[PDB]
Design an enzyme around this catalytic site. Structure first.
Site: not given
Lengths: 279, 837, 134
Positions: B704, B814, B782
């Site tokens: 991420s 996420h 997400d």
């Protein structure tokens, strides 16, 4: 023998309540006695009514976070007497030491209270017990650090229990393999009794087994064996313990039960059971 | 000379991961949470304190309220291991089957709570009243004061209601514990506990049950505030009751009309329906905010007689132009003022503002009556901008602020303030300022200048200094003892790899005294009486333990009170069977900058060998990967990687936190371009110091931001990295929210040069032509970084023909939450390296 | 921004309880899959004793199972399982206790009973029920 072994003579061990194994014996004099069936030792200076009671580790541990750092190392007893009565006590523990693989300082003695738990250091470690001088009467037991339930594979002076049921020219075997504890042995014997599964005594493994190690049960005579691989783990006497079911259906005098390590295929324990050795 | 990793079957890899998790060593799964210390009268028993907290004692998978008695005169030679007493007799607090309503599950995702049960609670000390939300609703109990301390667990009392949705964010009024507040259906409500009566004070949400039609909200934090500024509330109680008994509540009302909307799939896949969110992307418009009071008056029996709601005598946007966010807000302890922290849009001018309740007038639409309220305000009532922090990099937002209850000195106002943009490091300051007045004419509207309500500094005394900083974010606080003129805090004075406790006299800025033992990283929480404190600490080679200490010493010199180890609440485990703790190192760069790092040297190593390496990387700001804490349970996959023969290299390059501002300020407008050079420079160094690093087979792996950095490495340094496993990457920077991108990247109108070279989806033609050199992973549900980012990248790969692979996690936001998605993530991770490295 | 946290999960121990009742010659078995605890056995014992059912001791699974797994009950074809699957999950003690009943006319040479992992087809348990236990 179950009675306390002393120089003068074994003291008769009277059971008060068999549903909780409450025993109480009178130390008839000063000196040093011991009981092997529990593995306890005592050193006193007077003639005192000592009260010994068994109790499960789990019911005192349900509040404390102990069980994720220190592993249970022995049976948890409950002692009662007068204050200035007992000088030395020796609490059994199933941890093996003979090869010195594990250190002799990591042991501790448990002392429960309402506050919490106090973790004393024994006055002397010995290959089968821990020493404590001038005890404060509480539920007391031996603890070992390092959470070895999966780690350090610490040696365990384990034992093996065999239970049997005949049922009209048949035989069925319940084979338990546990750490050396009197409370666990007693709980197993009790739970088996209400199923007419009687025990038969046999020498235990003379070596130091490992925690979590797999052990394949087998025999020379091809018979029915239910869990092929047992584990050597600890589980409180109030719960149920693993074992193996064997439909031996003996058609021959000698059946050689046997167990073998899975990692290195080493043979550890074997016992041949004959008929007539039962009832 | 090289070493080739063993080839395993897919089921074999599954088996070794299952085994590595089974051999975790029976972790506690949660350490004791936020504590509260409550004294007891000594004649009541042998103990002296009762300690309340949250935790799960390995019994259930359910976080719960527990307490423990702190003994008196514990003996030294023997360690005392306190109990964990239950307080709610057989009360499960997780919803049925562990499924939460969308509001509270989104809040748990914003707070990253991976535990079930009571996650937080509110506690009133005097009445000893506990109020929380459990199952699907509010509960409360009483143990502290007049009720007498308990011995056996007791039953929690459900708070009956008539509202429809879930009651969010309960808060106990300090001035009166008979009431409380909450948020229901996006509006504010106040209720009584004894009489059971309720009342609604805000009328912003229509209840049309459609996010699109009812944009307004009252007393609740929006998305960008929850995610990028970590404020999870919008309402605040006035701690003093004013005289009928009048109570105040400062709250904010947001207006999300012009905020761009997006659609996100829902956890119910079969419906094939989406949920809409107001998601402001970089360059778009943020919601409109304002601050409002809400009075309510009661009598001796506790009945809400009246309930008004007021507003500033001028439009919030008029008194305070160039204000885009409300970072924090609250009252003073006497109730004479309400304060708030305003951030401008470029996030380079934060300022504390002090507001008197007298500036709030009822909402009068009749212009005749309104001009009467604007006439009745006293003369000395006006906003006060006590502090202003202007920087050149960006303003990190702190919670650290402690005003001192002023005596009858009408001019002065003294307070502590952890300023960070003054010296480049976060340091405490004791500043006294005179609240100057101007006696405004609120009838005539005013266009404030840049320095309208700014009051001049009378003194500004630094209390700490040096090339280190005071912990101020991620839930770090300070404790100020006003009976001894001290202040307890946490910082990195010893070494940037450890968090330690400190104390210094705020009257005379003398010498700082560390209260924790060196060689660990401590997270500790003081007592309200400043006689005990609990510390949670660990090191790279030791799992956490939770001890409680007792500050003893002569009462005349309180600074040098020695911290005595009193008892323990949790011990270490040492994870012995297969965990080799990593080894921290540090090097210098060609620009003469010290960086730290750690390496997981391969198990069963041999001289004259080379192992394939996996440069694990996050690289993004506000995260420090290398510190002297136990990484054994958080990142153990890296240990499993090492257990097979891989050499894992972690490195915290320029941009990470805990090292100052000028060090972190290297990413400004160049995000993406600079963090890889530090990773490759720190990877070539390990080739010199150690010799088992095979630079021929170098992977890279992130999540991420490291997923974003995994792709940048493969673009910029194709000869160094053979494969690249990006996880939930951020491909295009023009599709991320304002609260984060604008802070570091200066909206595309200004940084269109840097947005171009930073967005990895706009350079797809530089990725490898060969196959099996790029894996992509992303979660479908997400909402932090949406599936669009991976979806737009794949679209760009096809317009150029470059190969790729992809793995989607349909039921995962996420963060990978269920175990089957965790196992499948690691199992497929080893298999990619096993074949293509 | 914070690095996402992969969840940690540990398998737990469990036991399998076998209960039976004999009416004339037909056997009704009651199979219980339950995490290994103390209260649950001394509760389920009474719950089954009310209907004159009794216990038969057989070893529990050696492996540590995960909470939330589904297990196919399999046998030789001469059995009748009204629920064909069992589920390992915690259960409030004062609430209902799930099980699976099995109907067999005449056991004779003994009947096999197996639990099998739904997802991977693992034989994690077995039991060779014989009339000797009755």
């Amino acid at each position: 023998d179950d009675d306390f072994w002393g120089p003068s003579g074994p003291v008769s061990t009277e059971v008060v309540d068999r549903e909780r194994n409450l025993y109480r014996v009178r130390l008839p004099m000063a000196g040093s006695y011991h009981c092997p069936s529990t593995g306890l030792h005592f050193v006193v200076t007077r003639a005192v009514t000592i009260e010994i009671g068994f109790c499960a580790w789990s019911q005192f541990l349900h509040e404390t976070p102990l069980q994720h750092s220190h592993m249970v190392a022995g049976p948890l007893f409950d002692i009662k007497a007068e204050h200035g009565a007992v000088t030395a006590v020796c609490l059994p523990h199933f941890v093996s030491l003979q090869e010195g693989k594990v250190d002799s300082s990591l042991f501790h003695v448990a002392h429960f209270q309402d506050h919490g738990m106090v973790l004393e250091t024994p006055a002397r470690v010995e290959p089968h017990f821990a020493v404590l001088e001038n005890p404060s009467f509480s539920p007391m037991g031996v603890l070992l650090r390092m959470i070895p339930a999966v780690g350090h594979f610490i040696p365990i002076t384990s034992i093996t229990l065999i239970y049997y049921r005949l049922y009209l020219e048949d035989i069925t075997f319940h084979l338990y393999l546990v750490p050396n504890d009197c409370t666990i042995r007693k709980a197993i014997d009790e739970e088996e009794l209400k199923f007419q599964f009687v025990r038969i005594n046999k020498p235990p493994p003379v070596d130091a087994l490992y925690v979590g190690s797999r052990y394949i049960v087998s025999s020379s005579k091809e018979v029915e064996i239910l869990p092929k691989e047992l584990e050597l783990c600890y589980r409180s006497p109030r719960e149920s313990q693993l074992f193996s079911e064997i439909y031996v259906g003996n058609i021959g005098s000698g059946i050689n039960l046997q167990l073998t390590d899975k990692k290195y295929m080493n043979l550890i324990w074997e016992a041949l059971l004959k008929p007539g050795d039962l009832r | 000379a090289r070493f080739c990793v063993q080839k395993h079957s897919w089921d074999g890899l599954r088996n070794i991961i299952h085994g590595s998790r089974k051999s975790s060593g029976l972790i506690v799964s949660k350490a004791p949470h936020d504590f509260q210390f409550v004294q007891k009268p000594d004649e009541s028993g042998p103990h002296s304190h009762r300690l309340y907290y949250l935790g799960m004692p390995y019994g259930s998978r359910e976080n719960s309220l527990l307490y423990s008695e702190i003994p008196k005169k514990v003996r030294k030679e023997a360690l005392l291991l306190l109990s964990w007493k239950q307080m709610l007799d057989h009360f499960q607090a997780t919803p049925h089957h562990g499924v939460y309503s969308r509001e509270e599950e989104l809040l748990r995702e914003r707070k990253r709570l991976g535990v079930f049960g009571i996650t937080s609670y509110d506690f009133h000390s005097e009445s000893g009243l506990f109020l929380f939300q459990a199952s699907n609703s509010l509960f409360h109990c009483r143990d502290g004061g007049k009720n007498g301390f308990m011995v056996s667990p007791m039953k929690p009392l459900e708070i009956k209601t008539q509202c429809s949705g879930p009651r969010m964010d309960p808060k106990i009024c300090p001035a009166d514990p008979a009431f409380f507040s909450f948020i229901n259906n996006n509006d504010l409500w106040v209720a009584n506990i004894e009489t059971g009566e309720e009342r609604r004070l805000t009328f912003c949400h229509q209840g049309s049950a459609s996010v699109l039609d009812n944009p307004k909200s009252a007393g609740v934090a929006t998305f960008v505030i929850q995610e990028e500024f970590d404020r999870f509330t919008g309402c605040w109680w006035c701690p003093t009751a004013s005289w009928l008994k009048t109570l105040r509540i400062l709250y904010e009302e947001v207006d999300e009309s012009e905020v761009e909307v997006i659609h996100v799939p829902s956890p119910a896949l079969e419906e094939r329906k989406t949920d809409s969110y107001r998601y402001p992307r970089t360059g778009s418009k943020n919601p409109k905010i304002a601050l409002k009071l809400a009075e309510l008056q009661t009598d001796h029996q506790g009945k809400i007689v009246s309930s008004c709601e007021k507003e500033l005598v001028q439009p919030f946007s008029s008194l305070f132009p160039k204000v885009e966010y409300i970072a924090r807000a609250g009252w003073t302890r006497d109730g004479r003022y309400a304060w708030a922290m305003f951030l401008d849009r470029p996030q380079q001018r934060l300022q504390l503002v002090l507001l008197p309740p007298a500036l709030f007038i009822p909402t009068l639409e009749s212009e005749a009556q309104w001009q009467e309220a604007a006439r009745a305000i006293p003369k000395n009532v006006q906003p006060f901008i006590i502090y202003e922090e202007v920087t050149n990099v960006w303003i990190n937002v702190h919670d650290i602020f402690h005003p001192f209850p002023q005596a009858e000195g009408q001019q002065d106002f003294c307070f502590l303030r952890a300023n960070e943009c003054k010296t480049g490091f976060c340091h405490l300051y004791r500043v006294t300022v005179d609240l100057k007045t101007n006696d405004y004419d609120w009838t005539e509207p005013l266009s404030p200048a840049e320095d309208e309500f700014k009051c001049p500094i009378k003194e500004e005394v630094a209390l700490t200094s040096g090339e280190w900083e005071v912990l101020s974010r991620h839930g770090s606080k300070i404790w100020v003892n006003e009976q001894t003129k001290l202040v307890y805090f946490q910082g990195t004075k010893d070494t940037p790899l450890e968090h330690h406790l400190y104390v210094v006299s705020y009257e005379s800025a003398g010498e700082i005294v560390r209260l924790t033992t060196p060689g660990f990283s401590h997270s500790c929480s003081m007592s309200q009486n400043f006689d005990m404190f609990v510390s949670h600490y660990s090191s790279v080679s030791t799992p956490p333990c939770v001890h409680v200490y007792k500050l003893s010493g002569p009462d005349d010199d309180p600074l040098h009170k020695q911290p005595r180890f009193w008892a323990s609440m949790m011990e270490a485990a040492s994870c012995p069977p297969d965990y080799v703790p990593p080894e921290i190192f540090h090097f210098h760069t060609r620009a003469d900058v010290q960086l730290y790092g750690m390496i997981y040297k391969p198990h069963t190593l041999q001289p004259g060998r080379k192992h394939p390496t996996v440069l694990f990387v996050y690289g993004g700001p506000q995260v420090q990967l290398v510190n002297n804490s136990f990484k054994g349970i958080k990142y153990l996959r890296l240990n499993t990687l090492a257990s097979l023969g891989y050499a894992v290299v972690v490195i915290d390059g320029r941009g990470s936190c805990q090292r100052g501002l000028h060090f972190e300020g290297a990413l400004k407008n160049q995000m993406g371009q600079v963090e890889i050079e530090d990773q490759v420079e720190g990877l070539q160094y390990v080739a010199e110091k150690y010799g088992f690093i095979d630079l021929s087979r170098v992977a890279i792996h992130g999540w991420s931001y490291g997923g974003f950095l995994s792709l940048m490495g493969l673009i910029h340094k194709p000869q160094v990295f053979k494969v690249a496993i990006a996880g939930a990457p951020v491909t295009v920077w023009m599709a991320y929210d304002t609260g984060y991108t604008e802070r570091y990247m200066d909206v595309p109108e200004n940084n269109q040069q840097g947005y171009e070279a930073g967005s990895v989806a706009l350079h797809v033609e530089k990725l490898p032509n060969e196959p099996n050199r790029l894996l992509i992973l992303h979660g479908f549900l997400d909402e932090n970084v949406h599936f669009f980012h991976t979806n737009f990248l794949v679209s760009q790969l096809i317009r150029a023909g470059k190969p790729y692979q992809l793995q989607i996690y349909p039921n995962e936001r996420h963060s990978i939450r269920c175990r089957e998605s965790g196992e499948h993530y690691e199992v497929t991770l080893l298999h990619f390296l096993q074949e293509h490295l």
